[PDB]
Write a protein that binds this ligand. Structure first.
Ligand SMILES: NC(=O)c1ccc[n+]([C@@H]2O[C@H](COP(=O)([O-])OP(=O)(O)OC[C@H]3O[C@@H](n4cnc5c(N)ncnc54)[C@H](OP(=O)(O)O)[C@@H]3O)[C@@H](O)[C@H]2O)c1
Length: 647
């Protein structure tokens, strides 16, 4: 009798639920209605919203709630990636019910389902708006009335793949999804003290809930596998002297037996084509044609963005292969492996239903003494890999640093002048690099830093390049003339916002706006994703992403935003790291944080700030010097990627 136990549990609350016409959000909306709450459901398709509303209202009357027809409302055409539309959703909800007590940030899309090195930047941005920026947007508009009335709750529906406190969990090929789920948890952790005690804010993070989905995902896996084998062989041939752009006409002949027996093909490509013709299912054209159209366009994108070829070297496929490319048998073999992976994660060997998760969640929502937590209503999972955030302990080995002699360094930054200059001086004077290229945002910063190091600049050992925000272009320019990188160190162009996070009394003009939160995600998360996207394609690069310090004022709000940035970015660094471990060119990714775990640990004297800068140098070095590949150490290649090191 679960309905009987729900009765009156949330009597008189008004809940807004996004993505509320099916799945978990439909069940939470259903069970909140069955607990006496007025619910507004929001999704895109209006008829589904109508059918779910019908079903719920019927149950509400059977439960003997008064005037059941007026207890459920719908609001169609609500795409949570459309941040400006959420305002009309809220306006309508306050208009219909008078107030919002519960905000259930439930809607969540799957994202791009590509590796970091393949992800279109605007697909990344779209996932983050839908899964992450939507949640602050709704919270920020509702928080004033919620603070006023005081019985209020924000619930972000996150995931185990958004990690846990101080721990990131890599989700290969899903970095956008993982970053938005981590960011939902991070928002809960970072805001709870400012929104309390009137607003509780928590996340839930269910485990897995119950052509099919494993079929689409299996197909992507087979396509990715083929694309990686070709990219790898292309690099191994370019390694032996081949010019990649000149192999493209013959390669895009697409015939596997042609490529395998061409003397005009470098040996790597021939060994790959031989294996393919011998292993791939013969009932598919994949055994006779190298690539389909998707593989081809992505292969060219990896080569153009990695700087291996130019726009003029782009070729269409001579012959688009005939379906079926991958046979149904291959796709099923791989989908069963996907499914078994997921199922084997689970300690209980069974999955919850959407109703189960909803039920536990709706009970959880009745507890009034918990905030800033991540509740698992479904749970019990063993993960392939977890990465704890940590603190720098030790120094890099001399041998590894010597391997940096003569390399080219790319620095990306703007406002952290002292850090950038110290990095450059260290790389040139003590590491003996060939040269340091600095990519700034504004021209002025380029000129000032070129001045403070005018000596190295005259000698050609320091270069500056103002990007005016065009990160991809600067890396292409630098690669074109100033040398191909080893160490790449991305720092943020912009500082953290100096904004409040909660009201002083009933004044909210000073609290971080939705647009400002959007800018924060752009400049402290997407900025580094753009760097990692390009540099992950560069054979022989190392990537380090640096999260910003606080200002001298060092306000609690600023500290909260820094920890938000650190937690959210780590999901990217860990997923990029796990991807590197599996796919050539195995470019490592690691993260360095300039804000400490606890606020009392921040430097308070100039001597302590000197200790920090020294440590910062040592961590950037520890992650910049050549790291072990999977071939040298299977263990060390795993653990020396995906870290977040506080200094
Ligand atoms: N294995 C799991 O299912 C699992 C586990 C952990 C976490 N989660 C999280 O749980 C949440 C819901 O998962 P689910 O499996 O129930 O999702 P789902 O199957 O995609 O649920 C679909 C619901 O969301 C709506 N929706 C879809 N795209 C939308 C968009 N762009 N804007 C607004 N509404 C949209 C749909 O209506 P329309 O399509 O008509 O708009 C419908 O109401 C997500 O945040 C997800 O990350 C799920």
């Amino acid at each position: 009798g679960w309905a009987e136990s729900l009765f009156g549990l949330h009597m008189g609350k008004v809940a807004l639920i996004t993505g509320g016409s099916a799945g978990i959000g439909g069940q939470i909306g259903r069970l909140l209605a069955l607990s006496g709450a007025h619910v507004m459901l929001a999704a895109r398709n209006a008829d589904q919203l109508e059918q779910m509303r019908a079903s719920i209202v019927r149950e509400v009357r059977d439960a003997s709630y008064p005037d059941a027809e007026s207890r459920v409302a719908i609001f169609p055409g609500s795409d949570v990636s459309d941040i400006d539309g959420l305002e009309r959703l809220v306006n309508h909800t306050v208009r219909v019910f008078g107030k919002v007590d519960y905000l259930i940030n439930n809607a969540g899309i799957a994202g791009a389902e590509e590796m970091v090195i393949d992800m279109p930047v605007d697909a990344w941005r779209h996932t983050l708006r839908a899964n992450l920026i939507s949640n602050y947007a709704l919270l920020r508009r509702l928080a004033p009335q919620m603070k006023a009335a005081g019985g209020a709750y924000v619930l972000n529906v996150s995931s185990y793949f958004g990690g846990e406190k101080y721990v990131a969990i890599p989700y290969p090929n899903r970095s956008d999804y993982a970053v938005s789920k981590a960011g939902q948890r991070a928002m809960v952790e970072s805001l709870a003290r400012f929104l309390g005690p009137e607003i509780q804010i928590n996340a839930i993070a269910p485990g897995p809930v119950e052509p099919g989905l494993f079929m689409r995902r299996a197909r992507l896996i087979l396509e990715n596998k083929r694309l990686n084998e070709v990219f790898a062989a292309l690099l191994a041939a370019r390694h032996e002297g081949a010019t990649i752009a000149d192999l493209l006409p013959d390669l895009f002949a697409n015939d596997i037996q042609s490529i395998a027996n061409s003397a005009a093909m470098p040996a790597p490509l021939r060994r790959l084509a031989t294996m393919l013709r011998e292993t791939s299912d013969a009932g598919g054209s994949a055994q006779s044609y190298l690539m389909n159209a998707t593989i081809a366009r992505k292969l060219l994108n990896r080569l153009e963005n990695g700087g291996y070829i130019t726009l003029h070297d782009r070729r269409a496929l001579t012959v688009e292969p005939p379906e079926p490319f991958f046979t149904e048998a291959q796709i099923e073999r791989e989908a069963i492996k996907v499914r078994d992976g997921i199922l084997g994660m689970l300690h209980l060997q069974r999955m919850p239903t959407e109703f189960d998760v909803a039920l536990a969640t709706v009970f959880y929502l009745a507890d009034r003494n918990v905030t800033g937590e991540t509740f698992h209503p479904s749970g019990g999972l063993r993960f392939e890999r977890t990465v704890t955030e940590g603190e720098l302990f030790g120094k890099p080995g001399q041998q590894r640093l010597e391997r940096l002699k003569g390399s080219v360094v790319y620095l990306i930054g703007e406002h952290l002048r002292q850090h950038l200059v110290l990095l450059a001086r260290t790389f040139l004077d003590e590491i003996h690099v060939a040269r340091v290229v600095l990519l700034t945002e504004t021209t002025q910063a380029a000129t000032d830093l070129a001045a403070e190091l005018s000596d190295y600049e005259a000698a050609g050992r320091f270069v500056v390049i103002p990007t005016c925000g065009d990160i991809e272009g600067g890396i292409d320019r630098a690669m074109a003339e100033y040398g191909r990188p080893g160490p790449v160190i991305s720092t943020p162009f912009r500082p953290l916002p100096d904004r409040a996070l909660s009201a002083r009394n009933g004044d909210w003009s000073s609290v971080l706006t939705t647009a400002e939160f959007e800018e924060l995600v752009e400049q402290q998360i997407t900025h580094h994703f753009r760097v990692a996207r390009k540099a992950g394609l560069i054979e022989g690069a190392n990537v380090t992403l640096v999260t910003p310090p606080t200002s001298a004022r060092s306000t609690s709000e600023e500290f909260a935003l820094a920890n938000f940035v650190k937690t959210t970015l780590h999901a990217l660094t860990a997923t990029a790291g796990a991807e590197s471990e599996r796919t050539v060119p195995h470019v490592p990714v690691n993260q360095v944080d300039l804000t400490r775990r606890a606020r009392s640990e921040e430097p308070r004297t100039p001597s302590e700030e000197e200790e920090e800068l020294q440590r910062f140098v040592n961590a950037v070095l520890l992650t910049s010097a050549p790291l072990p590949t999977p071939l040298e150490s299977r263990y060390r290649a795993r653990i020396y990627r995906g870290n977040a090191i506080t200094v």
